[PDB]
Each structure stands twice: as C-alpha cells, then as structure tokens.
Ligand SMILES: Cc1cc2nc3c(=O)[nH]c(=O)nc-3n(C[C@H](O)[C@H](O)[C@H](O)COP(=O)(O)OP(=O)(O)OC[C@H]3O[C@@H](n4cnc5c(N)ncnc54)[C@H](O)[C@@H]3O)c2cc1C
C-alpha cells in the first residue's frame with residue numbers, strides 16, 4: 001500500500017502497523033472495548049499535558065533505503081529496533097539543484113559529475129579487489145559514504161515523534177529532512193488524530209507546519 | 214479475543230499483535246517480499262546463533278490485571294511500554310488477591326492453610342474498610358490508599374516486542390520466580406506460542422533459560 | 430569524596446553514593462574533547478540546554494541510595510532510562526512504615542481531626558504488620574506473608590541515572606501535580622544535582638524545567 | 646588516561662570511570678573483607694543477577710574508522726557523542742590495512758598491491774573531496790565521497806553490564822577483525838578497573854571466544 005521514493009534511489013516503505021489513534025486512547029484508559037469527539041479530545045489532552053506513554057502502544061515497521069551518511073544520522077535514535085542489510089551497489093549522486101543556493105566556483109553540474117566520477121572509480125576498485133579474492137568486509141571499506149543501504153525500522157509513535165522533532169527540521173541535513181517528510185506522511189495517514197495533536201502541541205520543528213502531509 | 218484467567222480475579226488478555234513468525238524472517242532478510250521449511254530453518258538458525266534483533270519486529274499489546282506485588286516484579290522489565298490504571302481517565306475498583314489454601318501445600322505451617330487464607334482476607338477487609346472510612350472523612354485518596362495492602366489488584370497495558378517478551382519468559386517462567394508471577398508468565402507464553410509458533414518452538418529448543426515451560 | 434544524605438518523610442532518605450563527571454563532562458562530550466576559561470564552557474551548557482541538545486548531559490551519571498515507601502517507589506521505578514537494584518537475601522530486611530503527620534492533612538477540611546487520621550493509619554498499619562509477623566511465625570513463606578503489608582512499607586534501592594534522564598524525572602516529579610510525598614523526594618534529588626552540576630542545573634531551571642516547585 | 650592505540654591511527658582512551666567492583670557489591674547489598682566481596686561478584690554473575698553491574702559506568706574516547714563505528718553504534722544501551730560530519734573539523738585520516746590483514750586468503754594479486762590499491766583510491770577520493778571544499782561545496786555534501794575507512798571520533802558512556810554484552814558480540818571471532826581489536830582494548834581497560842567483575846565474566850557469562858585466549 002505505502003511506498004515513497006526519496007532522493008535518487010531511496011525509499012520509505014511501510015511494512016506493518018499495529019494500532020491506530022484509538023490504541024493510545026485504550027492504553028490511557030486501560031480498557032479494551034468508542035466516542036469520536038471524546039476520544040479525539042483525549043488524544044489532544046494527552047499531547048497537550050505531555051502524558052506521552054500511551055503513544056507507545058502504536059508501533060510501525062518501515063523498510064528504508066538511504067545512503068550510509070543518512071543512515072548514520074538515523075541510527076542515532078536508540079529507542080527503536082533496526083535490522084540492516086549485511087547485496088547490490090548504488091550511490092546517491094546529488095542533482096545540480098542540490099547545489100544552487102551555494103555560491104561555488106565550478107558549475108553545480110560539474111560537482112554532480114565529479115561526485116559521480118569518484119563513485120565510479122571507488123566502485124571499480126572495490127569490484128577489482130573482490131575479483132582478486134579480497135574478502136568483502138575489507139574490500140568494501142573503499143566505498144563512499146553515499147552508498148545506499150537498507151534497513152527495517154520498528155518504532156513506536158512516541159519515539160517516531162521524537163524523530164520528526166529532530167529530523168523534520170530545517171537544521172537537519174536536507175537529505176534526512178526528505179526522509180522525515182515521508183515518515184510524517186505515513187504517520188499522518190495511519191494516526192491522523194495523533195499527528196494533528198502533535199503538530200498542535202508537541203512538535204518543535206519547522207517544516208511539517210509548512211508543507212502539507 | 215484471547216483471555217486467560219490467573220489467580221482468583223486476575224487475567225492476561227491479548228489486545229493487539231503486530232506480525233507473526235514471518236515478520237522476523239522479513240526483518241532478518243531486509244525484504245518485504247513462499248517456502249515454509251526454508252522460513253523455519255531461518256527462525257531456528259537466528260535463535261541458535263543469538264541473532265535476536267529480528268524478533269524485535271514482532272510486537273504484542275497485553276492487558277493484565279494483577280496484584281501490585283506481581284506488577285512490581287513485572288514493571289522491572291524496562292524494555293517495554295506500560296500504562297497503569299489510574300482513576301484519572303477510568304473507573305477504579307477494589308479487589309484483592311486471596312491465595313487458595315492449595316498455595317501453602319508443601320509448606321509445613323503451624324496454622325492450617327485455610328486459616329492463612331482467612332487471616333489474609335481479614336486484613337484485606339480491615340485495611341479496605343479503614344481506607345473507605347478515611348475517604349468518607351475527607352482524606353484525599355492519594356493519602357488514604359497508602360494503607361491498602363500489596364495484594365490490591367491493578368490493571369495495565371503492556372506493549373512488548375518478542376525479544377523482550379522472551380527475556381521476561383526467561384526470568385519469570387522459572388521455578389526461581391514467585392509462583393504468582395509464574396502463572397502470569399505461563400499465560401504470556403501461551404499467547405505468544407499461539408501467535409508465533411515457530412519462534413516459540415525455537416525459543417524453547419535453543420534460547421529458553423528457565424525450567425517450567427518444559428513441563429507444562 | 431562524594432557523599433550527601435537528605436532525610437525525607439518520617440524515616441526516608443536520599444543518599445548520594447557516587448557521581449561520575451561534572452558540568453565539564455557535558456562540555457567535553459559535546460566537543461568530543463578534553464577541556465577543563467569558564468565563560469565559554471558556561472555559554473555552551475546554556476546553548477545545549479536551550480536548543481534541546483541533551484545527549485551530552487548523558488555523560489554525567491549519579492548513583493543514589495533511596496529509602497522510600499513502596500507507593501513512592503512504584504512511581505519512581507516507571508523511569509526506565511535508569512538502573513535500579515532494590516533490597517532483598519543479600520542483606521537484612523527491616524520493617525518500617527510511612528506514617529503521615531497531622532500537617533499533611535492541612536487545608537483538607539476533614540470530618541475527624543488530623544491527629545485521628547494519623548492515628549488510624551498507624552493502627553491499621555500496625556495490625557497488618559502484626560498479622561505478617563504471625564504468618565511468618567507459623568511457617569508461611571515470606572513471599573506469601575508479605576502480601577498483607579501496606580503500600581506505605583519502606584523499601585530501599587540503588588538508582589544509577591544520567592543527568593538527562595534525571596532532568597526528565599525532575600520535570601515529572603518536582604511538580605505540584607505530583608503527589609506531595611514524591612515532590613519531597615524530587616526536591617532532594619534536585620538539591621543533590623544542583624550541588625554537583627551547578628551550571629547544568631541552573632541552565633535547566635532557566636531553559637528546560639517544566640515544573641513549578643523548584644523555582645521557589 | 647589509559648590509552649591504547651588500535652590499527653594504524655586509531656585508539657581507545659578512558660575519559661572517566663564511576664566506581665569499581667565494590668560499586669556492584671554495594672548495589673547488590675543496597676548499602677553504603679575482600680574474599681566475601683569477590684565471592685559475591687562471582688555469585689551474582691553465576692546466577693544471572695547482572696543488574697548490580699549497571700552501577701559501574703565508563704566513558705571512552707574512541708577514534709575509529711566509520712565502518713567500525715557503525716557496527717559499534719548498534720549497541721543502543723549506551724550514550725554516544727560523535728564528531729559532526731556536517732560541521733566538525735577532521736584529521737582526515739584513513740585505515741589502511743597492513744598487508745598481514747590479507748594473509749590467510751588466497752588472492753590473485755599480492756597483499757601489498759591490495760594495501761597499495763586501497764591507498765590510491767583513498768587518495769583520489771580525498772583529493773576530490775578537497776577540490777569540492779575548495780570549490781565552495783559545503784562539507785555536509787562534499788564528504789559523501791569519502792570512504793568508509795575514514796577515522797571518526799566519539800565519546801561512549803556505557804555501564805558494565807552493557808559493556809559485557811558488547812564484549813560478548815565484538816570480542817569474538819565472528820565479528821570483523823578490526824572491531825575485535827577495539828574490543829580487546831575495551832576488555833583491557835575494563836579488566837584494569839574492575840578485575841573481579843572481569844574474571845567472573847570470563848568464567849561464568851562471556852559468550853565470545855578470544856578474551857579466553859588473549860590476555
Ligand atoms: C500529566 C501526566 C499524567 C499521567 N498519567 C498516567 C497514568 O494514568 N498511567 C500511567 O501509567 N502513566 C501516566 N503518566 C506517565 C508516567 O508518569 C510515566 O510512566 C513516567 O512519567 C515515566 O516517564 P518517562 O517514560 O518519560 O521516563 P522513562 O521511562 O525514563 O523515559 C525517558 C524518556 O525516554 C523515552 N522513552 C524511553 N523508553 C521509551 C519507549 N519504549 N518508547 C518511547 N519512548 C521511550 C521518552 O521520550 C521518555 O520521555 C502520566 C504523565 C503525565 C505527565
């Protein structure tokens with residue numbers, strides 16, 4: 001059902017989800033059983049007064065493809081579960097549009113060309129080492145930080161909201177902002193009430209109030 | 214739609230589950246995209262080599278009604294999520310765990326087992342009544358209720374991934390735990406086996422550290 | 430040499446057993462370096478606190494020894510990003526209980542005089558204890574007997590907590606909406622944290638602290 | 646500060662430590678004779694009562710290739726502060742495996758060629774990086790061309806229980822040789838600060854292989 005492309009070869013794909021906004025309502029009340037307006041008011045109430053633990057009973061699993069340098073920033077979120085690929089070889093090459101804004105001394109397209117060339121040289125050294133009998137765990141160290149990896153991320157909505165706080169923000173690196181908007185979108189579609197209360201009361205960042213879904 | 218009664222008025226109820234044995238398999242392979250023997254071999258392989266992180270992608274929510282002493286041993290499992298009943302969003306009720314006389318069997322007591330049951334009962338009744346008398350007096354509940362005993366039943370939601378569930382089972386599905394938390398762990402075990410049989414079967418065979426799940 | 434003890438309630442306490450690092454520990458983590466002028470290091474602590482960059486404060490760690498009634502302990506133990514070891518089989522067990530003083534019931538217009546409330550609590554507590562002792566005398570195992578004991582029975586535990594998690598604790602428990610009893614314990618924890626990490630603590634009150642009682 | 650050099654440019658260094666074997670013994674006893682206290686450590690470890698070891702805490706300063714750092718940061722029950730790829734100044738150094746690293750494989754070019762080929766490619770990527778910086782390209786973008794052998798630095802605060810889990814998984818022959826080396830350095834510092842706990846860990850709860858044959 002839900003897969004969003006990010007960057008040149010990335011994605012965020014939704015694998016599974018447990019619960020919805022009413023999961024947090026039931027957990028707060030500690031009752032397994034509905035009144036829309038009242039249950040909506042509770043979500044807002046929880047979020048307004050920082051009673052956030054009921055949001056932990058909503059869990060998501062994502063399959064994410066992102067460059068290693070993005071993954072490293074992501075994996076710093078410790079309240080979450082991860083399984084990473086331990087195979088195929090693709091790389092994020094920034095478009096020229098990624099480098100307009102910045103005043104530079106060579107054309108933005110030349111930057112894209114240069115990055116692409118160095119990637120090609122590195123990969124080729126790697127394949128050459130692999131063909132020589134060099135084990136992969138050694139041969140791969142020449143590969144650049146823009147090598148795509150993939151991982152499964154299982155994460156509850158509370159910790160997901162910490163992630164949005166930190167990464168759906170103009171101080172975060174643009175690349176990771178893009179992934180974060182994809183995660184915000186899937187989150188909004190599954191837990192609309194919780195996302196809305198979040199934006200309203202607890203969200204510390206800037207982009208999700210700018211840019212729809 | 215799965216509930217097990219525990220002790221005289223307790224229960225463990227399955228509220229929700231995300232995934233099944235195949236969720237760990239997809240995690241280990243990092244593939245969203247069938248061969249059944251193949252998939253089991255992998256579950257067994259993961260278990261026996263201690264690669265437990267794929268099992269974190271299976272998750273349960275349980276609703277447990279337990280006496281406070283039990284809940285305190287339970288809440289010590291930090292890698293999980295909890296919400297306890299508070300009289301702030303929901304109705305509170307007052308029930309207490311009274312051991313059956315069978316519970317003292319094995320122990321050579323000076324007092325008959327039924328008399329132990331009755332003494333526990335008497336104390337519950339007297340504490341509960343002192344409590345009520347205090348509320349009626351205008352003592353706030355937060356103060357009044359400090360006289361209630363440890364066998365007062367509480368309720369909570371517990372959301373826990375399989376890896377941490379297995380840890381719980383290693384520690385509480387064991388003869389070394391208090392008998393009351395064992396019965397709760399047996400119920401956990403049973404719900405877990407129902408929803409992830411391949412995993413549970415591999416857990417017993419390879420990773421389970423306790424004793425009682427291999428007799429019941 | 431690190432060591433402080435603050436008495437809380439009638440028989441409770443919070444004791445500092447050890448501390449790793451100081452304000453400069455956070456400064457060093459944030460820079461990934463070995464610094465020890467104060468002007469700049471202080472600016473940086475504020476900077477970090479302001480912008481919600483809290484990870485460096487995780488590199489300051491405290492160990493506490495806490496004697497608190499079980500009801501206070503249950504709330505405390507909900508803080509999962511911390512390490513706990515509660516008293517057991519390695520030490521002698523003692524039996525003391527939190528009796529509130531009449532003044533605790535001030536402002537509450539009560540049907541019986543506050544001294545009577547205090548006296549009622551002692552009675553029912555004493556009764557529960559004496560029943561406990563008689564069950565123990567009769568051969569009832571302690572894990573069964575003890576379930577009659579009330580929520581004001583004092584326990585002891587060690588708590589090892591880092592400064593970021595400590596600050597979260599103070600945000601939740603040093604607040605007029607927490608139960609008074611725990612507010613008192615939070616005030617002792619705030620006191621010890623101020624003493625040992627003055628810059629962080631002061632930055633915390635100005636930029637991040639969410640409660641009301643510490644700013645009095 | 647104890648400091649142990651690992652690989653060509655790396656290290657583990659001890660920034661601070663809280664407590665020692667007795668910190669666990671005090672935690673276990675819940676209270677503020679050497680044979681009795683050593684014997685308690687053994688007992689705890691033997692019967693699975695590991696929570697008292699959470700009250701011994703370390704902070705390390707580690708300089709490691711990014712590929713080692715990445716395997717390391719999967720240990721979530723710890724606190725980490727790293728140089729910023731976007732902002733921090735770096736030493737731009739790189740791990741060049743010795744030729745001896747390849748001995749044990751049959752390869753079709755000599756191990757020294759392999760070492761040299763790794764150097765060349767590292768060299769071209771670094772120079773390309775410098776031309777991009779030189780050109781006005783911000784570092785958060787220009788750095789994506791650097792290889793995974795680039796050395797980074799991080800602070801690591803971790804309690805002894807979590808540290809023992811790390812040693813179970815990294816001071817082990819199935820782990821990549823490079824992280825083994827770092828694990829041995831961490832095992833050395835641990836052993837020095839907490840001799841009783843360390844001996845007990847080897848004897849009752851250590852699941853790896855190498856710390857039992859490598860002092
Ligand atoms: C106004 C108010 C009313 C409340 N009412 C109730 C109630 O009725 N019942 C009830 O049970 N609790 C209630 N709580 C919550 C209860 O107080 C918490 O269990 C306690 O405050 C622990 O706080 P914590 O989870 O932040 O601390 P810790 O558990 O130490 O967590 C520290 C921080 O780490 C993060 N964290 C740690 N583990 C996880 C995880 N698994 N998933 C996501 N994030 C994680 C969170 O960001 C958290 O803030 C209420 C809280 C407030 C503020």
Ligand SMILES: Cc1cc2nc3c(=O)[nH]c(=O)nc-3n(C[C@H](O)[C@H](O)[C@H](O)COP(=O)(O)OP(=O)(O)OC[C@H]3O[C@@H](n4cnc5c(N)ncnc54)[C@H](O)[C@@H]3O)c2cc1C
Nearest residue numbers: 289290291292384511514515517692693694699722806807
């Ligand atoms: C024989 C025996 C006797 C015991 N006696 C006592 C006693 O007297 N007093 C007492 O308080 N406890 C005692 N315990 C331990 C107590 O039972 C545990 O707190 C409880 O069983 C929870 O286990 P856990 O920490 O593994 O689970 P969780 O809290 O869910 O942690 C799960 C796993 O994550 C890791 N972990 C989580 N948080 C941290 C952290 N902050 N630091 C390092 N690692 C972490 C651990 O590897 C742990 O195995 C005893 C246990 C045993 C087996």
